Design a protein around this ligand. Structure first.
Ligand code: CLA
Ligand code: CLA
Ligand code: CLA
Ligand code: CLA
Ligand code: CLA
Ligand code: CLA
Ligand code: CLA
Ligand code: CLA
Ligand SMILES: CC1=C(/C=C/C(C)=C/C=C/C(C)=C/C=C/C=C(C)/C=C/C=C(C)/C=C/C2=C(C)CCCC2(C)C)C(C)(C)CCC1
Ligand SMILES: CC1=C(C/C=C(/C)CCC[C@H](C)CCC[C@H](C)CCCC(C)C)C(=O)c2ccccc2C1=O
Ligand code: SF4
Ligand code: SF4
Lengths: 728, 141, 81, 61, 73, 37
């Protein structure tokens, strides 16, 4: 059964005939997945989505198991086990041929290779991993499960495929997922934690012979060692039968802070955390109505909430949330993006793994990675919102609803929005350049820091304060503050900082305000494309014509770039700016007044020396006092054994300029040059039958923006990777 | 071979580098050997050799035969490509097979590029390489 | 407003008259080919410059052209304000 | 030059000027452009078929 | 050049050397390279020509210490 | 059957095939005698 692949265009009737010109190639890679553009049926669509999801999960399992396997046979884990400080983890040993021989990343113990930065060993310092053979079995299990569920997808598409009413039970969906998936998985992981994790963590305090430490089978029914610690953990005393839980104060506690013997927090808090979450959203997810004639009729809740300003409230919204798919796609994407960036903005003050704040390399890598993904996908959420607007709507089921009530007064909204953006924009940046001029003008008293004209963000200070003294009264059964950047003592280990309180002076003001500024303009562009998607004050045929089209002729002057995804083009440029300066700010502060070295007096000698109070106020200072440090080694960071990785930062500029080439130029020029080369080739009887044709302007715009983004992000990650290598 | 360039045999800095010349590959003689192979050319103050291109037998073969090798292989590949293209059109399945290569036919054409130069010379003398300015109908202007 | 230009290659499929949203065309009686009625521009003053019309002209070297002038006004520029 | 003969073109502005096409249908009516020729090389959207006045065509063979 | 030097071995990297400008340089009358041609050959047929005050010009050009046709690479 | 090549001969898969062939070609001469200059 192999007679079927090499029949291209199997899904489209038009491009199935033959490749007249090169255009036929391009569209082949463009319409391979939007099968909503293939028929009007839906069960087929849903089945395709299921199978694709299974395939994605399969590649997930594959790559994670393979990365394990590399971690088992080519990673200095079990030597780095006994010492997580004096050894830097590595993997991917270099192949000894011409060109890659000097790149032996030797990290002590003779182990060459590649000094990695992804902190998987940190998980492998919490999971309590002794020997690589169990890990070998783990990879085998991962890959076999991958193949298993792939076979399952094949079966559920080719032999027994689900029916159509199987789709729209969002009630049972929420119930099953919320409760069974999340709660059961979380409580199972907590059970694994208490049984194995903290025992071996105890056993990792003084060199207690890791492999000699017994295996879980020595604790499944062997409660003796389990009765050594935690006297209540004899069996459990099972006082839950007696409803008494005071005995369990041994392991299931509440400390809430840094544990200076683990490089992370107190794991017991995380275990009790997971317990509480498990049962909490179990009883939550038991809410909605199902097959027992009991529960909320959720399509009536939204009917109730209306009023004077509401119009008619949230009436008629489920046809949108189930009949169409792009809606759900967009909203869930936006939510995930936001969630991810708060995760990023979160796990640098509460490190949840062992040896995190003490390891000053994996932190910002993880941070920036997740932060980039967040935006990079929330813009896509907004794009799919717009594609819903153009693909799915209804004039009938959308009378006066809270939806329709904005599309009727969009002009006021967007006008006031533009107003706000202009205001904030110059109110911040022109102020900045004003201070710039003053410093360059021998008028230093007209500066704006503490030593000059004043402004102080009292609100952040007061909120941090009221957070400082929280325990005792707001948190009686709590020992230490939630973090130590708000308040508390400077927590550390060795000559190496873990967390100190962070200071907010004057420079914070304009930075946060320009953050808000760019977010405002981003929303402006995206929402503008959103509202003005179907009908503009000049183009009343937009939705009547599509959302992916270049222009509408030189009428009314010009009209090029009047679709919506060009709006999201401009938006993605802007969000690039946003996140770039955001990571600039984060890195510079957390290397300027949070991180460095320490003396026996707890004397934090930071890396840079507090440069914001000195230079992060004028533009010329911002280039001097940031990239002077961020590159002064990359010029010479090559030229020895553990340096030879000449980085492609020198290389990314080229792709950047090659990028911008595509933007500024039209296409007819290239078409004519093509025709001349064709003339020559035809004169020498080598004319390619398939007649080449230049790119379409939207295609060229896309490749230009793609190359632009690629070059920029490659440049910046090269920058701070080498910068951390210079200190980590 | 003038311009103030010392022979790579007796350039002191050349052997100075050669001493701790970082032996690249998995064989200890790698570096030293190559430096020994670099005595024929003539170094300079930079300690590294420049190449002279004149047909002058001091460095003639160090540039001529690679050029001729490239000409050989480029002629072969261009010749076999043009021949394949010419052949395809006598099938009336032109753009069907433009993406599906007919291997049982694509092989012997590749294997039969042995005598491309002189055969091409023949097609030059026979005039079997160009079509006529007006017969070629590709309209300019 | 702008100027319109007509030719002889009008086959008479009349896809342009159904494409222009600006009412600047009409098929006046002709005799030459099987068309018998050839397109023309009677109401140029409402020309817009969208030139969606010749994109609807299938004839080789499409039979209609528009010479985009310079005497624009509030009508030719198309403003609701 | 009959129905099914290969001829080149004399019309100057033609995209296939001097190019050879086959006379698909010999019309000879009162229209100024009787001859219907078919090509395979594509201009805009493939107008490989067109009409001309046969006072603008010349055969090859 | 970039990759070859990016491995630590610069000797595996190509160095060209222009000589046409060298020949024209000496042929105008430069002696630095010692080719004895056309005012580097003080006895050729044209070696009794040029300016009728070419001695000072020769003192100047031989003194390539200033910006007068500097060597190349 | 042997029909697989009928459905393996696509060009793209054949591209990478030929390119990798030529690549290992270039390697072996650079792998066996990378010591001739
Ligand atoms: C997740 C995807 C993934 C990726 C990107 C890689 C990538 C790589 N693997 Mg690999 N590998 C994977 C999954 C993956 N592997 C899985 C799932 C297994 C278990 C079956 C292995 C088992 C494996 C072995 C045993 C070896 C590699 C090796 C390699 C390196 C050279 C590849 C080679 O020549 O083939 C493999 C070549 C030979 C086995 C010979 C390369 C970095 C080689 C290497 O350089 O060592 C790390 C090597 O020896 N891999
Ligand atoms: C252009 C010639 C060339 C060739 C043929 C190779 C070939 C190789 N390199 Mg490599 N490399 C080169 C130039 C080259 N290198 C240069 C110029 C640099 C920068 C100085 C590097 C830096 C480099 C690193 C850092 C690593 C390699 C690795 C590898 C191996 C797996 C990657 C591979 O082939 O693709 C992928 C193929 C498969 C996965 C199969 C392979 C032996 C990897 C290695 O040795 O372990 C696998 C590795 O980690 N290379
Ligand atoms: C031949 C090129 C090559 C290849 C195949 C890999 C492959 C890999 N690198 Mg790697 N790396 C390379 C060059 C390469 N690297 C270079 C030139 C550097 C800079 C010196 C690094 C620095 C580096 C670090 C710091 C880390 C990796 C990691 C990884 C692994 C994560 C997989 C991944 O990114 O999936 C996507 C596939 C690609 C990006 C390709 C993977 C085995 C990570 C790892 O081992 O995690 C456990 C990790 O932490 N690499
Ligand atoms: C408690 C029972 C239960 C559990 C645990 C799940 C679990 C899951 N369902 Mg599911 N489902 C259930 C009951 C349940 N379902 C019922 C009763 C219905 C009928 C209404 C569905 C209908 C349904 C659909 C229609 C889809 C899922 C999907 C999924 C997966 C979402 C992706 C994910 O979690 O990434 C986990 C990632 C890693 C572990 C890595 C997940 C495995 C999605 C899917 O295809 O899976 C990918 C999907 O599209 N479910
Ligand atoms: C899980 C995430 C996810 C999923 C399933 C999709 C799925 C889809 N996207 Mg999409 N997108 C996403 C994330 C996602 N996107 C993000 C994060 C962004 C922002 C970077 C975009 C930006 C985007 C644009 C701008 C477009 C799509 C389009 C499409 C559709 C056609 C894609 C295709 O066949 O590619 C084929 C082409 C290549 C593989 C190249 C398809 C329904 C296209 C569309 O509207 O089709 C309906 C389209 O024009 N997407
Ligand atoms: C030198 C760089 C530069 C500068 C100074 C501006 C300045 C401006 N742009 Mg802008 N822009 C730029 C590059 C720049 N852009 C580039 C390269 C792009 C393409 C990626 C854009 C894309 C763009 C869009 C899509 C939008 C702006 C907007 C704005 C205005 C915001 C209002 C404000 O704060 O006034 C700044 C005043 C002073 C500095 C004085 C402002 C006039 C927005 C706007 O109209 O806001 C009202 C808007 O919608 N621009
Ligand atoms: C955009 C923000 C911004 C803000 C808030 C200020 C605020 C101020 N500027 Mg200023 N300035 C700015 C941008 C800005 N400037 C820019 C972009 C330039 C061009 C380089 C200047 C050039 C400038 C000069 C040359 C001088 C000031 C002066 C002043 C002060 C006098 C206030 C005044 O007359 O307001 C009047 C407000 C209303 C009538 C309303 C005040 C603190 C004066 C000063 O006190 O020295 C610092 C002064 O001599 N500014
Ligand atoms: C392109 C080459 C070149 C150039 C620029 C010059 C330039 C010059 N030659 Mg000359 N010369 C040349 C080749 C050249 N020569 C050759 C090849 C011969 C051999 C036949 C001569 C033989 C020659 C004689 C015999 C004389 C000149 C003289 C001169 C000068 C007067 C202008 C003139 O005759 O011309 C002038 C600087 C004259 C001069 O300056 O004498 C004072 C003069 O008498 N030349
Ligand atoms: C984020 C992320 C990630 C991760 C993920 C994860 C980590 C997940 C998780 C998941 C999980 C963690 C899951 C779990 C699950 C579980 C469950 C779902 C359970 C259930 C259970 C049950 C069902 C039970 C049953 C039973 C038994 C067993 C006995 C008898 C009785 C009964 C029947 C009850 C990754 C890397 C991928 C990617 C990136 C991102
Ligand atoms: C270069 C360029 C072209 C040229 C058009 C094309 C199609 C050039 C593409 C050339 C080929 C398709 C690139 C192939 C890339 C591969 C690396 C080539 C490998 C081929 C061999 C290995 C077989 C445009 O048509 C254009 C249009 C509008 C705005 C900007 C531009 C623009 O910048
Ligand atoms: S211009 Fe086009 S649409 Fe108008 S009559 Fe002629 S062929 Fe028909
Ligand atoms: S732009 Fe074209 S379609 Fe519009 S009025 Fe002018 S001629 Fe008619």
């Amino acid at each position: 059964s192999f007679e079927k692949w090499g029949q291209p265009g199997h899904f489209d009737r038009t491009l199935a005939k033959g490749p007249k010109t090169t255009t036929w190639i391009w569209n082949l890679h463009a319409l391979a997945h939007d099968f909503d553009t293939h028929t009007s049926d839906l069960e087929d669509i849903s089945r395709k989505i299921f199978a694709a999801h299974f395939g994605q999960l399969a590649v997930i399992f594959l790559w994670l198991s393979g990365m394990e396997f590399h971690g088992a046979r080519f990673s200095n884990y079990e030597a780095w086990l006994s010492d997580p400080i004096g050894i830097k983890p590595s993997a991917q040993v270099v192949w000894p041929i011409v060109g890659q021989d000097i790149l032996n990343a030797d990290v002590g113990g003779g182990f060459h290779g590649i000094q990695i930065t992804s902190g998987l060993f940190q998980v492998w310092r919490a999971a309590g991993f002794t020997n690589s053979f169990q890990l070998y079995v783990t990879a085998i299990g991962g890959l076999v499960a991958a193949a298993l569920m792939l076979f399952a997808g094949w079966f559920h598409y080719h032999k027994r495929a689900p029916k159509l009413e199987w789709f729209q039970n969002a009630e049972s969906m929420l119930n099953h997922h919320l409760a069974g998936l999340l709660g059961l998985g979380c409580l199972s992981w907590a059970g694994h934690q208490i049984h194995v994790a903290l025992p071996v963590n105890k056993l990792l305090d003084a060199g207690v012979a890791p492999k000699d430490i017994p295996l879980p089978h020595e604790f499944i029914l062997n409660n003796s060692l389990m009765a050594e610690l935690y006297p209540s953990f004899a069996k459990g005393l099972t006082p839950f039968w007696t409803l008494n839980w005071g005995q369990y104060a041994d392991f299931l506690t509440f400390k809430g802070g840094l544990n200076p013997v683990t490089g992370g927090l107190w794991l017991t808090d995380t275990a009790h955390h997971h317990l509480a979450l498990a049962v909490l959203f179990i009883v939550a997810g038991h809410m909605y109505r199902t097959n027992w004639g009991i529960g909320h009729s959720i399509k009536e809740i939204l009917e109730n909430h209306k009023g004077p300003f509401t119009g008619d409230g949230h009436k008629g919204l489920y046809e949108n949330m189930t009949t169409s798919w792009h809606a759900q796609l967009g909203t869930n994407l936006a939510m995930l993006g936001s969630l991810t960036i708060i995760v990023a903005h979160h796990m640098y003050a509460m490190p949840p793994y062992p040896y995190l704040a003490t390891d000053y390399a994996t932190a910002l890598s993880i941070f920036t990675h997740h932060m980039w993904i967040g935006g990079f996908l929330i813009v896509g959420g907004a794009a799919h919102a717009t594609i819903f607007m153009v693909r799915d709507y209804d004039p009938a089921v959308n009378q006066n609803n809270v939806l329709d009530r904005v599309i009727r007064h969009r002009d006021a909204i967007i006008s006031h929005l533009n107003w706000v953006c202009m205001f904030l924009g110059f109110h911040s940046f022109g102020l900045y350049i004003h201070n710039d001029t003053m410093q360059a003008l021998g008028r230093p008293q007209d500066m704006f820091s503490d030593t000059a004209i004043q402004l102080q963000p009292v609100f952040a200070q007061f909120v941090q304060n009221i957070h400082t003294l929280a325990p005792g009264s707001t948190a009686p059964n709590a020992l230490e503050p939630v973090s130590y950047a708000f308040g508390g003592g400077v927590v550390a280990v060795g000559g190496k900082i873990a967390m100190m309180p962070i200071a907010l002076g004057t420079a914070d003001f304009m930075i946060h305000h320009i953050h808000a500024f760019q977010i405002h303009v981003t929303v402006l562009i995206l929402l503008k494309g959103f509202l003005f998607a179907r009908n503009s004050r000049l183009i009343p045929d937009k939705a009547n014509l599509g959302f992916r089209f270049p222009c509408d002729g030189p009428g009314r002057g010009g009209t090029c770039q009047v679709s919506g995804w060009d709006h999201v083009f401009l938006g993605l440029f802007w969000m690039f700016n946003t996140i770039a300066i955001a990571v600039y700010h984060f890195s510079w502060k957390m290397q300027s007044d949070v991180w460095g070295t320490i003396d026996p007096d707890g004397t934090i000698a930071h890396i840079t020396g507090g440069n914001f109070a000195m230079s992060a106020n004028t533009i010329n200072g911002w280039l001097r006092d940031y990239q002077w440090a961020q590159a002064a080694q990359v010029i010479q960071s090559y030229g020895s054994a553990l340096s030879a990785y000449g980085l492609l930062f020198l290389g990314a500029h080229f792709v950047w300029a090659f990028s911008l080439m595509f933007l500024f130029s039209g296409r007819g020029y290239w078409q004519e040059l093509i025709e001349s080369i064709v003339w020559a080739h035809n004169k020498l009887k080598v004319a390619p039958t398939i007649q080449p044709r230049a790119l379409s302007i939207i295609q060229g715009r896309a490749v230009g923006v793609a190359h632009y983004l690629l070059g920029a992000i490659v440049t910046i990650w090269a920058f701070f990777e080498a910068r951390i290598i210079s200190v980590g | 071979v003038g311009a103030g360039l010392v022979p790579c045999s007796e350039s002191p800095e050349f052997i100075q580098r050669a001493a701790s010349a970082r032996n690249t590959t998995a064989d200890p003689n790698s570096g030293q050997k190559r430096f020994e192979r670099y005595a024929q050319e003539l170094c300079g103050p930079e300690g590294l050799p420049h190449l002279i291109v004149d047909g002058r037998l001091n460095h003639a073969g160090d540039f001529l035969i690679p050029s001729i090798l490239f000409l050989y292989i480029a002629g072969w590949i261009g010749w076999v490509g043009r021949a394949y293209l010419q052949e395809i059109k006598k099938r009336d399945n032109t753009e069907l097979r433009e993406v599906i290569i007919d291997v049982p036919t694509a092989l012997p054409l590749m294997l039969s590029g042995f005598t491309w130069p002189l055969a091409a010379v023949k097609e030059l003398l026979s005039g079997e390489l160009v079509a006529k300015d007006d017969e070629i109908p590709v309209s300019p202007r | 407003s702008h100027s319109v230009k007509i030719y002889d290659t009008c086959i008479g499929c009349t896809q342009c008259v159904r494409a222009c949203p600006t009412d600047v065309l009409e098929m006046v009686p002709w005799d030459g080919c099987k068309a018998g009625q050839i397109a023309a521009s009677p109401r140029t003053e409402d020309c817009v410059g969208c030139k969606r019309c010749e994109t609807a002209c299938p004839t080789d070297f499409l039979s209609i052209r528009v010479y985009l002038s310079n005497a624009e006004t509030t009508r030719s520029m198309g403003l609701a304000y | 030059v009959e129905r099914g003969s290969k001829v080149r073109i004399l019309r100057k502005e033609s995209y296939w000027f001097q190019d050879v096409g086959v006379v698909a249908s010999v019309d000879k009516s009162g229209i100024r452009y009787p001859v219907i020729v078919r090509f395979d090389k594509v201009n805009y959207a493939g107008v490989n078929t067109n009409n001309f006045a046969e006072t603008e065509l010349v055969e090859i063979e | 050049n970039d990759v070859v030097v990016a491995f630590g071995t610069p000797e595996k990297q190509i160095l060209i050397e222009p000589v046409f400008a060298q020949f024209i340089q000496a042929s105008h009358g430069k002696v630095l390279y010692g080719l004895n041609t056309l005012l580097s050959n003080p006895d050729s047929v044209a070696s009794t020509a040029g300016a009728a005050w070419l001695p000072g010009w020769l003192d100047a050009i031989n003194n390539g210490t200033n910006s007068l046709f500097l060597t190349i690479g | 059957q042997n029909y697989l090549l009928r459905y393996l001969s696509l060009g793209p898969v054949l591209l990478f095939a030929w390119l990798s062939f030529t690549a290992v070609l270039l390697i072996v001469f650079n792998y066996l005698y990378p010591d001739l200059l």
